[PDB]
Amino acid sequence: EIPKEMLRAQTNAILLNVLKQGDNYVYGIIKQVKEASNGEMELNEATLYTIFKRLEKDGIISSYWGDRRKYYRLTEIGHENMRLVSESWSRVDKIIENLE
Amino acid sequence: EIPKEMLRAQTNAILLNVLKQGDNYVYGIIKQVKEASNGEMELNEATLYTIFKRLEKDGIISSYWGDRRKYYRLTEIGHENMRLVSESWSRVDKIIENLE
Numbered sequence A, B: 001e002i003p004k005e006m007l008r009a010q011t012n013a014i015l016l017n018v019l020k021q022g023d024n025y026v027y028g029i030i031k032q033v034k035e036a037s038n039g040e041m042e043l044n045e046a047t048l049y050t051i052f053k054r055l056e057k058d059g060i061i062s063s064y065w066g067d068r069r070k071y072y073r074l075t076e077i078g079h080e081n082m083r084l085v086s087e088s089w090s091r092v093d094k095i096i097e098n099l100e
Helices: A004-021 A026-036 A045-057 A076-099 B004-021 B026-036 B045-057 B076-099
Strands: A061-065 A070-074 B061-065 B070-074
Touching (some): A004 A026, A004 A045, A004 A070, A004 B004, A004 B076, A026 A045, A026 A070, A076 B026, A076 B076, B004 B070, B026 B045, B045 B061, B070 B076
Antiparallel strands (some): B061 B070
């Protein structure tokens, strides 16, 4: 079985990437990840609220109300964290390909 | 900055993949990961001993002496864990590509 730490890391990376594509709300993110995973990954609302609480506390994202619906955005510094995260994950992929 | 949980997850995945290529010893693994990362990732010996302690405790790998040098191997069940881990990481990559 996959370590829970690993699953959490993957979920974090995917959610940050969704918000990089644009500000979004929980149900909208779930829909986008379900589609992008071809049905494979159906995230739970409560899982996102846990993760976003941490990311908001850390200043990586912030929230705001729409026209009552909560939208999330990467912060200015969150965009930097996203860039470093993206680079590290691309680096992993390149390492794995060389090892095979 | 990258969450330590994320870095740990990536390191775990890379090390399991190295052992999938064959049984190996700490310095040998460090060398292989340095090469496969084009110099970018120089793992520390003590980092590997921490990780392998956990993986051995969990029954994912085991150790044995060479002809004194410690070699590590994926266990029978470790190979299953490797397969599930590999699938989840490939799945992440496909999700990220669809999101972009």
